Amino acid sequence: LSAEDKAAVERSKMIDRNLREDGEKAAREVKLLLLGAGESGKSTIVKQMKTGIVETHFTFKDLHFKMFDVGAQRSERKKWIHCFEGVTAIIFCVALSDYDLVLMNRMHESMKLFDSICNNKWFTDTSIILFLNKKDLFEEKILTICYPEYAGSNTYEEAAAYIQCQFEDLNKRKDTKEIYTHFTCSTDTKNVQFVFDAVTDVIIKNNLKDCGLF
Amino acid sequence: SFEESRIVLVVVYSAVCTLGVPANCLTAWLALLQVLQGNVLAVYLLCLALCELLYTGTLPLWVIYIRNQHRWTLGLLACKVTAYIFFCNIYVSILFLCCISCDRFVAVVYALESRGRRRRRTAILISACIFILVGIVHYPVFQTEDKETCFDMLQMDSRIAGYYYARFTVGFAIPLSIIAFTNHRIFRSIKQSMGLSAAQKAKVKHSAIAVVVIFLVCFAPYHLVLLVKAAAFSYYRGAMCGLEERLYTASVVFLCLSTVNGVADPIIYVLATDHSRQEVSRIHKGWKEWSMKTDVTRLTHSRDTEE
Amino acid sequence: SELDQLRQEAEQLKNQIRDARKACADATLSQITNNIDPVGRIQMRTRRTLRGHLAKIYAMHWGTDSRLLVSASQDGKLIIWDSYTTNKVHAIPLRSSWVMTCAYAPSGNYVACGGLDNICSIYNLKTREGNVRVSRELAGHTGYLSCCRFLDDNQIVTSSGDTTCALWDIETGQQTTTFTGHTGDVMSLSLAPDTRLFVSGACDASAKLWDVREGMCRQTFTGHESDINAICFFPNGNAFATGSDDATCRLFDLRADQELMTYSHDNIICGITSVSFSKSGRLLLAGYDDFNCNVWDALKADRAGVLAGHDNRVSCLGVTDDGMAVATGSWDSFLKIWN
Amino acid sequence: DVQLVESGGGLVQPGGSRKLSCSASGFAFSSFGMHWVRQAPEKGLEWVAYISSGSGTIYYADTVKGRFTISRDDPKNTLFLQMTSLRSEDTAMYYCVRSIYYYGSSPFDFWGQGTTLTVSSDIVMTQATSSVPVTPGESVSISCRSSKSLLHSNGNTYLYWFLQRPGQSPQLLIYRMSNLASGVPDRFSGSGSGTAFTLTISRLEAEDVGVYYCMQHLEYPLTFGAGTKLEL
Amino acid sequence: SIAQARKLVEQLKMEANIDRIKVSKAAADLMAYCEAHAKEDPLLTPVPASENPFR
Predict the structure, then answer these.
(1) Which residues lie on this side of the membrane: Extracellular (chain B)?
(2) Which of B107, B115, B273 comes nearest A28 by C-beta?
(3) Which of A71, C172, C310, D155 is the most buried (most CB within 10 A)?
């Protein structure tokens, strides 16, 4: 209770007001998690929406988008996966024409990454979006190399439906969650339209959960 | 006739209060624990439940003392206070449910833009402004003379009847338009969407139509009796006695059903929504462990001791 | 086969140490501390609540004056605090919002901040400029900066997720000495008070000693069965203790190189995320994945005190050098200190 | 490094008005608190006004209140002071002072150049003798007494020592009676009791010549001392 | 994995020249540090509110 203490209270109030304004400015941004694997078209997705983690920012209509690309981390995933708990959406990128490649095919080990990330305890209710890549090359080259158990049509659309169906039902944690698959042509104009319509579909339902309705 | 009608309505009034008070206190504690996590309408439900608890035990004292035959054993300050809490509660509960519906509207349809408008300071500001407004609006009822009887003296004077009709017009009919507008826009906004499947579509239809239908069917009878009283008085300023007696009986039974809806609003709120169903389930488990009627570990100790 | 014949001679060398480990150990410390009077009950109440952050608080560090502390939160802001008056003194924006560690310099001039961005950031507090500016960025790691600690004003030792620990210097920004030998990513490190020997813990179920000057491994301590999340050093400088995901806190001596005891309870299945001592020992603070903290007797492994202030999982914890208070932060965005 | 330059110090008709501005550059002036300090043209340093970091708390003196006002504007990074009703007491060499306020902060650390402005209870603190003859190399000691003790309940006494270099701006030596400022040699050291306050000059050489001052900091009035001209 | 075999086992033979004492008398240094500084330890022996700066 002196002039120094009063001015300290003054400076504390000043820093609190600045912090509150900064938090209110930061809360509007939408957080997106990209889990694109090797040769998953991360270059394609960053060129279509336009040493550690790479952070990118883009604007769609009146809504800000803040995505953090986790690439070449080369570490145990469990130590830092809980850092992205507050992230609204998880974006997955998977190539389709690499079913003829074995390191143990890339396709099969890609489902194990998805099975692990879907069944975790942090991501009980986080909307999952998965994309595709190299689908035109997959149609051109194609079945028996990677999925002989299908034993059916070599046609592209039925084969693409088969592969998409397997990822939709990796485990039953997707029952409480909501998977949002999209046939990524890799030439489609705005595949963020899939993301924007999905991320608002989370936002209404996240509001509805907070509205005490559904 | 009139005496038996009033005695059966005050008996069912006492029964409705003694079935509704613990649900009111449970919902008040539930909203108090729900305001700890950030929800703008959580403090709306808190304020609505507290306003309910304001009058849920005031009128029971008088109506259990004696059905009123213009006898006031007290100094009538308490009866003026109970009339204050009742009038203020009715108007503030109508305004609180309608601003809850407006918050639901602005949460659902304009969900992208509302993320900056859902700061909690606006919620406390709106609730406090509505509370102070309804108190200042009521204050002429405290100013009213003719303290021979304090429940109503509308049988002889039409000036205070016009004042009460003005209060009715500013506090009853416009909120019906507000809830109808907000709920119909809720209907359209959820029904053009495709990501939400058909089960939750029918669910939100049923819940919103349930709350608007109970609001209508329980308060529009009060609207019609007040409107027919005002129209009859405006026509015949210059069978009136029989119409007024039947209107008095209709008004007291309609007051009974309106306060039935008022005490039932938190019960319909906790029963209509499933998140509050599991929430009241775990609150039930907490009440059971605070009551200790299970006694499973002490029973196992007892059976181990005797054997 | 030439690598295979080098295996079993290394295994008998692992047999050469472990029977010599067992030759030294006949009586544990638990039988020694039977006669000593137990500490009893330690009732601690929250004197000050140093809240004001907005997101999950991940790391703290006490100042040398035992008044100021630095707190790192995942919102992207670094806050220097005040203990008694509960008023924040500096708010530091971060270039990368991802932060998992923070350090307060012993001189009080500097604050180190890191994260998973593979960059160590050191900020000058008391500048002639008057603002708080980063001195320079520090980029030589390829993992995630798990913990950085100030050995000196000019010398800083950090622990990073590229399975290596590196000694830095500010004036040139290069690794003077780098420490290799941990197979997995290290998670925490706690230097001795004399700032000559330090220890690091990893996701190896083992911890290894390090000498700062020449950068060679001195001791290899194992006995854990999962990843070590946090480590702390005995302020005597003759011992240290570890915390892991196994819900067991284990006490080790440097030259006596043995597991003295494990601090485990059956109701505690949640792992440890923060370990700190008292000045005289006779105490071990321990933060768990369950939302309450815990206090352990350092000598008898008893349930001495219970700290149940926070409602979320406690991430960071620390004690003053004069012992006046213990600090504790969690993901509930709150800092509260007991006494 | 930093620049505190003052503008518009000249002749004013008595009782009139004059705008005074302090141009600031090279520091976070939006975060820095700002003061104004009167220097009489012959003798006597005293305080004028205080402005907050966020322009929330404003303080004035006895002859300053009402007829003086002080403002600021962060985006163009300058300090303002509109000044009215001037007379012979208002004739002064007003100095621009910055002061930051937190734990361990050193207020009054840097000073401006001044304004040549001519026209046409409180805590008493007295320095003992205004003139001390010295020799370049022997240790001397000076002190100033306080009306009341400066020892607050938090165990920290609040007192600041200053050196008026002959003809130019002063500087801060030691803040809060025990902690030396940056850029100052360790020879200067203050001490004293809870009421008696003193400075210990050790091994002085030929730049410490000038008038010395001591200040109260328990309250925003921030009363000064008379001044000890330290001649050779 | 041929290159790792040397520097893995150079660690083991560098660990052969290790200091050795008795753990029971090493545990005495654990105890002897406690009661020496327990007089000024304010956790197990909390100071009164006048000496406490956290009130």
Answers:
(1) 67-80, 143-161, 234-249
(2) B115
(3) C310
What secondary structure does DSSP assign to C85-99, as a single string?
Answer: S----EEEE-SSS--
Strands (DSSP E) contained in C94-173 are 102-104, 110-113, 120-124, 133-138, 145-150, 155-160, 164-169
Size of interface C-D (CB pairs under 8 A): 21
Q: Distances in Å between the alpha carbon of E12 and those of C23, C256, C316, E18?
A: 18, 17, 35, 10
CATH number at residue C55: 2.130.10.10
**CA gap B282, B294 in Å, rounded:** 15
The CATH number covering residue E28 comes to 4.10.260.10
> B2-298 maps to which CATH number?
1.20.1070.10
Fold of the D3-119 domain: Immunoglobulin-like (2.60.40)
User: B137-175 b/e with 16+ CB inside 10 Å = b?
Assistant: bbeebeeeeeeeebeeebeeeeebbeebbebbeebbeeb
Q: Rounded to a whole number, what is the distance in Å from the CA of E17 to chain C's nearest CA?
A: 10
Please tell me which chains touch D, using 3 or more CB pairs under 8 Å as the contact test. Answer: A, C
Considering only the beta carbons, identify the residue of A11, A74, A83 that sits closest to C143. Answer: A74
Chain D contact for C129, CB < 8 A? yes
- How many cross-chain Cβ pairs, A to C, lie less than 8 Å apart? 70
Across the interface, do E23 and C10 touch by the CB < 8 Å criterion?
no
Cα separation, C206 vs C184, whole angstroms: 10
Residue C78 CB coordination number (10 Å): 22
Specify whether the CB–CB gap between A160 and A183 falls below 8 A. yes
Chain Cα centroid distance, residue B23? 13
Cα–Cα distance for residue pair B249/A179, rounded to 1 Å: 59
In chain B, DSSP finds a helix count (H) and a strand count (E) of 11, 0
Q: Could you tell me if C280 and C266 are in contact, meaning their C-beta atoms sit under 8 angstroms apart?
A: no
Do residues D161 and D190 touch, judged by C-beta distance below 8 A? yes
Tokens read off for D91: 């004739």
**A177 located within any domain:** yes
Do E and C count as touching (3 or more CB pairs closer than 8 A)? yes
Residue B72 corresponds to which tokens in the numbers above? 């006031």
| Sheet architecture: strand order including C206-211 | C186-191, C197-202, C206-211, C217-222
How many angstroms separate the CA atoms of D153 and C257, rounded?
50
CA distances from A167 to A170, B216, B289, D7 (A): 5, 49, 44, 73
Burial category of D62 from C-beta neighbours within 10 Å (exposed 0-12, middle 13-18, buried 19 and up):
exposed
What residues contact B106, with CB distance under 8 A and at least 6 apart?
Answer: B114, B117
d(CA B128, CA B88): 13
The verdict on D101 touching A (C-beta cutoff 8 Å) is yes
What is the rounded (10 degree) CA torsion for D34, D40, D46, D51?
A: -20
Check: CB of residue D95 under 8 Å from CB of residue D39. Answer: yes
Q: Which domain holds residue A135?
A: 30-202
* DSSP string computed for A81-118: HGGGTT-SEEEE--BSS-TT-B--BHHHHHHHHHHHHH
Closest by Cα among A200, E53, A165 to B110: A200
- Helix (H/G/I), strand (E/B), else coil: A153: coil
- Contact status, residue B105 vs residue B182, Cβ threshold 8 Å: yes
Are E13 and C24 in contact (CB < 8 Å)?
A: no
Task: Please name the member of B111, B204, B275 whose beta carbon is closest to the beta carbon of A200.
Answer: B111
Q: Quick one: resolution in A? A: 3.0
Please provide residue B209's backbone torsions phi and psi, each rounded to the nearest 5 degrees: -70, -30
Q: Which token pair is B130?
A: 């509505």
Residue type (1 letter), C69: L
Q: Which DSSP letter does residue B256 get?
A: H
Per the CB < 8 Å rule, is A3 touching D217?
yes
